[PDB]
């Protein structure tokens, strides 16, 4: 059992441009943005002391540095100055035309008709002739080849401008539910756009596909994938079990996995009715109560170059600054694959050099015993 040992006895072959990795403690990925401001230097140290593998989210500091990719560029620079080994990822959505970057600034209801060349990249509602939207965010059309070329170009420009080590690509679906008859064409178009992005990107850049581990046409192009656990089904005992096999398959293919948990996805009765700072306090408390269970779920399936993300959202103030001491306890190399304790139960165990993991994904209990 070596630091690169895959749970099935095979060996992980990292590429040279990948993030640092070790089993010393629970490996951590942090992903965050704050539309309001840049991180203070103290906050950069807090996050940089937690993670060597970070991603800046869709609107970071846009309200004070005008454009999200300028926010990202600022954090890339601040983190790498103090920790040159840190990898920092840009963010870009494949589907929702968030107007936070310079690249997307014209996808607004007051600017888009000044840019007919860009409007043509968007899905139109056939009955009304109006643009499809969600809270007035428009929808890219992956079936449109001029859009795919523009998008690849735009993503590469953002990575290059920001100096990031790669990009987190969010959304895989291609709004297929609005064009269900062309599901096959949507899926191939997505895979093709992702393949073209990987080729256009510098060959030392990490391409991370959110929820892409099982997206057959996209998998060949990505170096990394996130498991986002955005709903109840994703958190089901059956899907956690599936995901452990997916993490193995990612490892075998040379790819990184991010196992992200946000406790907001539980819809715990604890948060019902609450708003503002009060809702925040309840979600933080819930993250601290649930950490052992969710840490165990990751550890059961952990492979080399897999990382845990934790909190209760995607912001600077939903986890990265929060002290979770169990994520810093000594872990060590795993001692082989997990075990399903007995047939048709949902208890699983795994042992590491400095810890024993038990988790019941049916009754949502866990115990990590630290040595």
PDB file of N, CA and C in Angstrom, residues 184-265:
ATOM      1  N   UNK A 184     -29.320  12.883 -28.433  1.00  0.00           N
ATOM      2  CA  UNK A 184     -28.068  12.314 -28.913  1.00  0.00           C
ATOM      3  C   UNK A 184     -27.144  13.391 -29.458  1.00  0.00           C
ATOM      4  N   UNK A 185     -27.690  14.329 -30.231  1.00  0.00           N
ATOM      5  CA  UNK A 185     -26.886  15.402 -30.794  1.00  0.00           C
ATOM      6  C   UNK A 185     -26.366  16.345 -29.718  1.00  0.00           C
ATOM      7  N   UNK A 186     -27.194  16.657 -28.727  1.00  0.00           N
ATOM      8  CA  UNK A 186     -26.738  17.473 -27.603  1.00  0.00           C
ATOM      9  C   UNK A 186     -25.545  16.812 -26.925  1.00  0.00           C
ATOM     10  N   UNK A 187     -25.668  15.523 -26.617  1.00  0.00           N
ATOM     11  CA  UNK A 187     -24.601  14.865 -25.869  1.00  0.00           C
ATOM     12  C   UNK A 187     -23.302  14.855 -26.669  1.00  0.00           C
ATOM     13  N   UNK A 188     -23.390  14.629 -27.985  1.00  0.00           N
ATOM     14  CA  UNK A 188     -22.176  14.608 -28.793  1.00  0.00           C
ATOM     15  C   UNK A 188     -21.584  15.995 -28.915  1.00  0.00           C
ATOM     16  N   UNK A 189     -22.441  17.006 -29.035  1.00  0.00           N
ATOM     17  CA  UNK A 189     -21.967  18.379 -29.135  1.00  0.00           C
ATOM     18  C   UNK A 189     -21.232  18.795 -27.873  1.00  0.00           C
ATOM     19  N   UNK A 190     -21.781  18.461 -26.709  1.00  0.00           N
ATOM     20  CA  UNK A 190     -21.067  18.749 -25.461  1.00  0.00           C
ATOM     21  C   UNK A 190     -19.720  18.090 -25.397  1.00  0.00           C
ATOM     22  N   UNK A 191     -19.679  16.814 -25.731  1.00  0.00           N
ATOM     23  CA  UNK A 191     -18.409  16.113 -25.717  1.00  0.00           C
ATOM     24  C   UNK A 191     -17.417  16.763 -26.652  1.00  0.00           C
ATOM     25  N   UNK A 192     -17.893  17.173 -27.825  1.00  0.00           N
ATOM     26  CA  UNK A 192     -17.034  17.800 -28.819  1.00  0.00           C
ATOM     27  C   UNK A 192     -16.571  19.167 -28.346  1.00  0.00           C
ATOM     28  N   UNK A 193     -17.448  19.934 -27.692  1.00  0.00           N
ATOM     29  CA  UNK A 193     -17.001  21.240 -27.222  1.00  0.00           C
ATOM     30  C   UNK A 193     -15.962  21.076 -26.126  1.00  0.00           C
ATOM     31  N   UNK A 194     -16.143  20.080 -25.271  1.00  0.00           N
ATOM     32  CA  UNK A 194     -15.164  19.815 -24.218  1.00  0.00           C
ATOM     33  C   UNK A 194     -13.858  19.313 -24.792  1.00  0.00           C
ATOM     34  N   UNK A 195     -13.924  18.508 -25.844  1.00  0.00           N
ATOM     35  CA  UNK A 195     -12.688  18.042 -26.454  1.00  0.00           C
ATOM     36  C   UNK A 195     -11.943  19.199 -27.093  1.00  0.00           C
ATOM     37  N   UNK A 196     -12.664  20.089 -27.777  1.00  0.00           N
ATOM     38  CA  UNK A 196     -12.031  21.258 -28.386  1.00  0.00           C
ATOM     39  C   UNK A 196     -11.458  22.203 -27.339  1.00  0.00           C
ATOM     40  N   UNK A 197     -12.136  22.345 -26.197  1.00  0.00           N
ATOM     41  CA  UNK A 197     -11.574  23.164 -25.121  1.00  0.00           C
ATOM     42  C   UNK A 197     -10.272  22.583 -24.589  1.00  0.00           C
ATOM     43  N   UNK A 198     -10.234  21.273 -24.368  1.00  0.00           N
ATOM     44  CA  UNK A 198      -9.005  20.669 -23.837  1.00  0.00           C
ATOM     45  C   UNK A 198      -7.842  20.890 -24.783  1.00  0.00           C
ATOM     46  N   UNK A 199      -8.103  20.777 -26.090  1.00  0.00           N
ATOM     47  CA  UNK A 199      -7.037  20.970 -27.057  1.00  0.00           C
ATOM     48  C   UNK A 199      -6.599  22.420 -27.111  1.00  0.00           C
ATOM     49  N   UNK A 200      -7.547  23.362 -27.014  1.00  0.00           N
ATOM     50  CA  UNK A 200      -7.163  24.774 -27.131  1.00  0.00           C
ATOM     51  C   UNK A 200      -6.408  25.248 -25.908  1.00  0.00           C
ATOM     52  N   UNK A 201      -6.715  24.680 -24.762  1.00  0.00           N
ATOM     53  CA  UNK A 201      -6.056  25.061 -23.536  1.00  0.00           C
ATOM     54  C   UNK A 201      -4.596  24.620 -23.570  1.00  0.00           C
ATOM     55  N   UNK A 202      -3.738  25.398 -22.915  1.00  0.00           N
ATOM     56  CA  UNK A 202      -2.362  24.970 -22.743  1.00  0.00           C
ATOM     57  C   UNK A 202      -2.317  23.557 -22.199  1.00  0.00           C
ATOM     58  N   UNK A 203      -1.285  22.789 -22.505  1.00  0.00           N
ATOM     59  CA  UNK A 203      -1.309  21.380 -22.123  1.00  0.00           C
ATOM     60  C   UNK A 203      -0.866  21.138 -20.684  1.00  0.00           C
ATOM     61  N   UNK A 204      -0.602  22.191 -19.927  1.00  0.00           N
ATOM     62  CA  UNK A 204      -0.387  22.084 -18.494  1.00  0.00           C
ATOM     63  C   UNK A 204      -1.590  22.585 -17.703  1.00  0.00           C
ATOM     64  N   UNK A 205      -2.749  22.763 -18.355  1.00  0.00           N
ATOM     65  CA  UNK A 205      -3.965  23.236 -17.700  1.00  0.00           C
ATOM     66  C   UNK A 205      -4.952  22.119 -17.370  1.00  0.00           C
ATOM     67  N   UNK A 206      -5.499  22.183 -16.159  1.00  0.00           N
ATOM     68  CA  UNK A 206      -6.456  21.201 -15.656  1.00  0.00           C
ATOM     69  C   UNK A 206      -7.854  21.550 -16.141  1.00  0.00           C
ATOM     70  N   UNK A 207      -8.497  20.604 -16.826  1.00  0.00           N
ATOM     71  CA  UNK A 207      -9.877  20.742 -17.266  1.00  0.00           C
ATOM     72  C   UNK A 207     -10.744  19.864 -16.374  1.00  0.00           C
ATOM     73  N   UNK A 208     -11.637  20.495 -15.610  1.00  0.00           N
ATOM     74  CA  UNK A 208     -12.462  19.833 -14.606  1.00  0.00           C
ATOM     75  C   UNK A 208     -13.915  19.908 -15.042  1.00  0.00           C
ATOM     76  N   UNK A 209     -14.553  18.772 -15.239  1.00  0.00           N
ATOM     77  CA  UNK A 209     -15.951  18.740 -15.634  1.00  0.00           C
ATOM     78  C   UNK A 209     -16.840  18.460 -14.463  1.00  0.00           C
ATOM     79  N   UNK A 210     -17.685  19.434 -14.089  1.00  0.00           N
ATOM     80  CA  UNK A 210     -18.618  19.197 -12.993  1.00  0.00           C
ATOM     81  C   UNK A 210     -19.615  18.098 -13.353  1.00  0.00           C
ATOM     82  N   UNK A 211     -19.739  17.101 -12.475  1.00  0.00           N
ATOM     83  CA  UNK A 211     -20.658  15.984 -12.655  1.00  0.00           C
ATOM     84  C   UNK A 211     -20.426  15.255 -13.982  1.00  0.00           C
ATOM     85  N   UNK A 212     -19.186  15.228 -14.463  1.00  0.00           N
ATOM     86  CA  UNK A 212     -18.901  14.636 -15.757  1.00  0.00           C
ATOM     87  C   UNK A 212     -18.329  13.225 -15.691  1.00  0.00           C
ATOM     88  N   UNK A 213     -18.197  12.627 -14.504  1.00  0.00           N
ATOM     89  CA  UNK A 213     -17.533  11.323 -14.387  1.00  0.00           C
ATOM     90  C   UNK A 213     -18.247  10.236 -15.189  1.00  0.00           C
ATOM     91  N   UNK A 214     -19.570  10.330 -15.308  1.00  0.00           N
ATOM     92  CA  UNK A 214     -20.428   9.382 -15.995  1.00  0.00           C
ATOM     93  C   UNK A 214     -20.994   9.958 -17.286  1.00  0.00           C
ATOM     94  N   UNK A 215     -20.470  11.085 -17.762  1.00  0.00           N
ATOM     95  CA  UNK A 215     -20.961  11.720 -18.969  1.00  0.00           C
ATOM     96  C   UNK A 215     -20.061  11.219 -20.080  1.00  0.00           C
ATOM     97  N   UNK A 216     -20.573  10.224 -20.813  1.00  0.00           N
ATOM     98  CA  UNK A 216     -19.717   9.368 -21.626  1.00  0.00           C
ATOM     99  C   UNK A 216     -18.974  10.144 -22.698  1.00  0.00           C
ATOM    100  N   UNK A 217     -19.626  11.098 -23.357  1.00  0.00           N
ATOM    101  CA  UNK A 217     -18.913  11.796 -24.431  1.00  0.00           C
ATOM    102  C   UNK A 217     -17.923  12.843 -23.903  1.00  0.00           C
ATOM    103  N   UNK A 218     -18.022  13.244 -22.638  1.00  0.00           N
ATOM    104  CA  UNK A 218     -17.162  14.301 -22.089  1.00  0.00           C
ATOM    105  C   UNK A 218     -15.948  13.732 -21.345  1.00  0.00           C
ATOM    106  N   UNK A 219     -16.122  12.619 -20.628  1.00  0.00           N
ATOM    107  CA  UNK A 219     -15.056  11.917 -19.907  1.00  0.00           C
ATOM    108  C   UNK A 219     -13.718  11.883 -20.647  1.00  0.00           C
ATOM    109  N   UNK A 220     -13.645  11.581 -21.944  1.00  0.00           N
ATOM    110  CA  UNK A 220     -12.315  11.506 -22.569  1.00  0.00           C
ATOM    111  C   UNK A 220     -11.533  12.789 -22.510  1.00  0.00           C
ATOM    112  N   UNK A 221     -12.194  13.937 -22.379  1.00  0.00           N
ATOM    113  CA  UNK A 221     -11.485  15.197 -22.471  1.00  0.00           C
ATOM    114  C   UNK A 221     -11.035  15.749 -21.123  1.00  0.00           C
ATOM    115  N   UNK A 222     -11.610  15.298 -20.024  1.00  0.00           N
ATOM    116  CA  UNK A 222     -11.371  15.966 -18.741  1.00  0.00           C
ATOM    117  C   UNK A 222     -10.236  15.284 -17.986  1.00  0.00           C
ATOM    118  N   UNK A 223      -9.542  16.085 -17.168  1.00  0.00           N
ATOM    119  CA  UNK A 223      -8.514  15.609 -16.252  1.00  0.00           C
ATOM    120  C   UNK A 223      -9.063  15.389 -14.858  1.00  0.00           C
ATOM    121  N   UNK A 224     -10.245  15.925 -14.589  1.00  0.00           N
ATOM    122  CA  UNK A 224     -10.809  15.983 -13.256  1.00  0.00           C
ATOM    123  C   UNK A 224     -12.324  16.033 -13.370  1.00  0.00           C
ATOM    124  N   UNK A 225     -12.998  15.587 -12.319  1.00  0.00           N
ATOM    125  CA  UNK A 225     -14.445  15.721 -12.261  1.00  0.00           C
ATOM    126  C   UNK A 225     -14.873  15.943 -10.818  1.00  0.00           C
ATOM    127  N   UNK A 226     -15.976  16.642 -10.654  1.00  0.00           N
ATOM    128  CA  UNK A 226     -16.574  16.900  -9.353  1.00  0.00           C
ATOM    129  C   UNK A 226     -17.828  16.052  -9.218  1.00  0.00           C
ATOM    130  N   UNK A 227     -18.047  15.533  -8.023  1.00  0.00           N
ATOM    131  CA  UNK A 227     -19.342  15.004  -7.624  1.00  0.00           C
ATOM    132  C   UNK A 227     -20.037  16.052  -6.744  1.00  0.00           C
ATOM    133  N   UNK A 228     -21.119  16.637  -7.238  1.00  0.00           N
ATOM    134  CA  UNK A 228     -21.636  17.876  -6.638  1.00  0.00           C
ATOM    135  C   UNK A 228     -22.674  17.654  -5.540  1.00  0.00           C
ATOM    136  N   UNK A 229     -23.384  16.527  -5.530  1.00  0.00           N
ATOM    137  CA  UNK A 229     -24.255  16.187  -4.417  1.00  0.00           C
ATOM    138  C   UNK A 229     -25.243  17.325  -4.186  1.00  0.00           C
ATOM    139  N   UNK A 230     -25.837  17.790  -5.291  1.00  0.00           N
ATOM    140  CA  UNK A 230     -26.749  18.930  -5.277  1.00  0.00           C
ATOM    141  C   UNK A 230     -28.164  18.557  -4.888  1.00  0.00           C
ATOM    142  N   UNK A 231     -28.515  17.263  -4.835  1.00  0.00           N
ATOM    143  CA  UNK A 231     -29.870  16.916  -4.413  1.00  0.00           C
ATOM    144  C   UNK A 231     -29.908  15.613  -3.622  1.00  0.00           C
ATOM    145  N   UNK A 232     -31.139  15.263  -3.213  1.00  0.00           N
ATOM    146  CA  UNK A 232     -31.400  14.117  -2.354  1.00  0.00           C
ATOM    147  C   UNK A 232     -30.999  12.822  -3.035  1.00  0.00           C
ATOM    148  N   UNK A 233     -31.318  12.684  -4.328  1.00  0.00           N
ATOM    149  CA  UNK A 233     -30.885  11.503  -5.071  1.00  0.00           C
ATOM    150  C   UNK A 233     -29.363  11.382  -5.082  1.00  0.00           C
ATOM    151  N   UNK A 234     -28.655  12.485  -5.345  1.00  0.00           N
ATOM    152  CA  UNK A 234     -27.203  12.381  -5.351  1.00  0.00           C
ATOM    153  C   UNK A 234     -26.678  11.902  -3.997  1.00  0.00           C
ATOM    154  N   UNK A 235     -27.381  12.204  -2.916  1.00  0.00           N
ATOM    155  CA  UNK A 235     -26.951  11.791  -1.585  1.00  0.00           C
ATOM    156  C   UNK A 235     -27.477  10.422  -1.158  1.00  0.00           C
ATOM    157  N   UNK A 236     -28.313   9.797  -1.973  1.00  0.00           N
ATOM    158  CA  UNK A 236     -28.859   8.495  -1.622  1.00  0.00           C
ATOM    159  C   UNK A 236     -27.772   7.456  -1.396  1.00  0.00           C
ATOM    160  N   UNK A 237     -28.067   6.494  -0.518  1.00  0.00           N
ATOM    161  CA  UNK A 237     -27.118   5.405  -0.265  1.00  0.00           C
ATOM    162  C   UNK A 237     -26.751   4.669  -1.547  1.00  0.00           C
ATOM    163  N   UNK A 238     -27.725   4.471  -2.445  1.00  0.00           N
ATOM    164  CA  UNK A 238     -27.449   3.794  -3.707  1.00  0.00           C
ATOM    165  C   UNK A 238     -26.466   4.600  -4.551  1.00  0.00           C
ATOM    166  N   UNK A 239     -26.678   5.910  -4.646  1.00  0.00           N
ATOM    167  CA  UNK A 239     -25.784   6.703  -5.481  1.00  0.00           C
ATOM    168  C   UNK A 239     -24.412   6.877  -4.843  1.00  0.00           C
ATOM    169  N   UNK A 240     -24.326   6.981  -3.516  1.00  0.00           N
ATOM    170  CA  UNK A 240     -23.004   7.022  -2.907  1.00  0.00           C
ATOM    171  C   UNK A 240     -22.233   5.769  -3.258  1.00  0.00           C
ATOM    172  N   UNK A 241     -22.902   4.622  -3.223  1.00  0.00           N
ATOM    173  CA  UNK A 241     -22.239   3.387  -3.606  1.00  0.00           C
ATOM    174  C   UNK A 241     -21.801   3.448  -5.066  1.00  0.00           C
ATOM    175  N   UNK A 242     -22.701   3.890  -5.966  1.00  0.00           N
ATOM    176  CA  UNK A 242     -22.290   4.040  -7.356  1.00  0.00           C
ATOM    177  C   UNK A 242     -21.063   4.930  -7.441  1.00  0.00           C
ATOM    178  N   UNK A 243     -21.091   6.052  -6.718  1.00  0.00           N
ATOM    179  CA  UNK A 243     -20.015   7.040  -6.811  1.00  0.00           C
ATOM    180  C   UNK A 243     -18.680   6.474  -6.343  1.00  0.00           C
ATOM    181  N   UNK A 244     -18.691   5.586  -5.357  1.00  0.00           N
ATOM    182  CA  UNK A 244     -17.411   4.992  -4.966  1.00  0.00           C
ATOM    183  C   UNK A 244     -16.789   4.251  -6.144  1.00  0.00           C
ATOM    184  N   UNK A 245     -17.606   3.539  -6.924  1.00  0.00           N
ATOM    185  CA  UNK A 245     -17.080   2.905  -8.118  1.00  0.00           C
ATOM    186  C   UNK A 245     -16.653   3.902  -9.180  1.00  0.00           C
ATOM    187  N   UNK A 246     -17.383   5.026  -9.283  1.00  0.00           N
ATOM    188  CA  UNK A 246     -16.996   6.084 -10.211  1.00  0.00           C
ATOM    189  C   UNK A 246     -15.644   6.687  -9.833  1.00  0.00           C
ATOM    190  N   UNK A 247     -15.386   6.849  -8.536  1.00  0.00           N
ATOM    191  CA  UNK A 247     -14.099   7.415  -8.114  1.00  0.00           C
ATOM    192  C   UNK A 247     -12.953   6.477  -8.460  1.00  0.00           C
ATOM    193  N   UNK A 248     -13.176   5.177  -8.275  1.00  0.00           N
ATOM    194  CA  UNK A 248     -12.213   4.172  -8.712  1.00  0.00           C
ATOM    195  C   UNK A 248     -11.971   4.268 -10.212  1.00  0.00           C
ATOM    196  N   UNK A 249     -13.046   4.340 -10.994  1.00  0.00           N
ATOM    197  CA  UNK A 249     -12.887   4.408 -12.439  1.00  0.00           C
ATOM    198  C   UNK A 249     -12.149   5.672 -12.840  1.00  0.00           C
ATOM    199  N   UNK A 250     -12.420   6.807 -12.162  1.00  0.00           N
ATOM    200  CA  UNK A 250     -11.660   8.025 -12.445  1.00  0.00           C
ATOM    201  C   UNK A 250     -10.181   7.819 -12.158  1.00  0.00           C
ATOM    202  N   UNK A 251      -9.883   7.227 -10.999  1.00  0.00           N
ATOM    203  CA  UNK A 251      -8.505   6.977 -10.627  1.00  0.00           C
ATOM    204  C   UNK A 251      -7.821   6.101 -11.666  1.00  0.00           C
ATOM    205  N   UNK A 252      -8.520   5.071 -12.142  1.00  0.00           N
ATOM    206  CA  UNK A 252      -7.907   4.142 -13.083  1.00  0.00           C
ATOM    207  C   UNK A 252      -7.601   4.824 -14.408  1.00  0.00           C
ATOM    208  N   UNK A 253      -8.369   5.848 -14.764  1.00  0.00           N
ATOM    209  CA  UNK A 253      -8.202   6.587 -16.010  1.00  0.00           C
ATOM    210  C   UNK A 253      -7.219   7.733 -15.879  1.00  0.00           C
ATOM    211  N   UNK A 254      -6.585   7.877 -14.716  1.00  0.00           N
ATOM    212  CA  UNK A 254      -5.662   8.963 -14.480  1.00  0.00           C
ATOM    213  C   UNK A 254      -6.297  10.282 -14.097  1.00  0.00           C
ATOM    214  N   UNK A 255      -7.567  10.297 -13.727  1.00  0.00           N
ATOM    215  CA  UNK A 255      -8.254  11.555 -13.462  1.00  0.00           C
ATOM    216  C   UNK A 255      -8.461  11.827 -11.975  1.00  0.00           C
ATOM    217  N   UNK A 256      -8.588  13.108 -11.660  1.00  0.00           N
ATOM    218  CA  UNK A 256      -8.898  13.570 -10.318  1.00  0.00           C
ATOM    219  C   UNK A 256     -10.396  13.615 -10.075  1.00  0.00           C
ATOM    220  N   UNK A 257     -10.772  13.392  -8.820  1.00  0.00           N
ATOM    221  CA  UNK A 257     -12.150  13.477  -8.359  1.00  0.00           C
ATOM    222  C   UNK A 257     -12.213  14.506  -7.241  1.00  0.00           C
ATOM    223  N   UNK A 258     -13.252  15.341  -7.272  1.00  0.00           N
ATOM    224  CA  UNK A 258     -13.638  16.181  -6.144  1.00  0.00           C
ATOM    225  C   UNK A 258     -14.955  15.639  -5.611  1.00  0.00           C
ATOM    226  N   UNK A 259     -14.969  15.225  -4.352  1.00  0.00           N
ATOM    227  CA  UNK A 259     -16.158  14.774  -3.647  1.00  0.00           C
ATOM    228  C   UNK A 259     -16.590  15.971  -2.798  1.00  0.00           C
ATOM    229  N   UNK A 260     -17.557  16.736  -3.301  1.00  0.00           N
ATOM    230  CA  UNK A 260     -18.008  17.963  -2.652  1.00  0.00           C
ATOM    231  C   UNK A 260     -19.302  17.678  -1.922  1.00  0.00           C
ATOM    232  N   UNK A 261     -19.417  18.177  -0.696  1.00  0.00           N
ATOM    233  CA  UNK A 261     -20.656  18.114   0.067  1.00  0.00           C
ATOM    234  C   UNK A 261     -21.002  19.528   0.504  1.00  0.00           C
ATOM    235  N   UNK A 262     -22.241  19.927   0.261  1.00  0.00           N
ATOM    236  CA  UNK A 262     -22.786  21.096   0.911  1.00  0.00           C
ATOM    237  C   UNK A 262     -24.012  20.657   1.672  1.00  0.00           C
ATOM    238  N   UNK A 263     -24.085  20.958   2.964  1.00  0.00           N
ATOM    239  CA  UNK A 263     -25.187  20.421   3.750  1.00  0.00           C
ATOM    240  C   UNK A 263     -26.515  21.076   3.418  1.00  0.00           C
ATOM    241  N   UNK A 264     -26.507  22.200   2.690  1.00  0.00           N
ATOM    242  CA  UNK A 264     -27.754  22.818   2.253  1.00  0.00           C
ATOM    243  C   UNK A 264     -28.557  21.865   1.405  1.00  0.00           C
ATOM    244  N   UNK A 265     -27.894  20.885   0.824  1.00  0.00           N
ATOM    245  CA  UNK A 265     -28.567  19.990  -0.085  1.00  0.00           C
ATOM    246  C   UNK A 265     -29.446  18.997   0.651  1.00  0.00           C
TER     247      UNK A 265
END
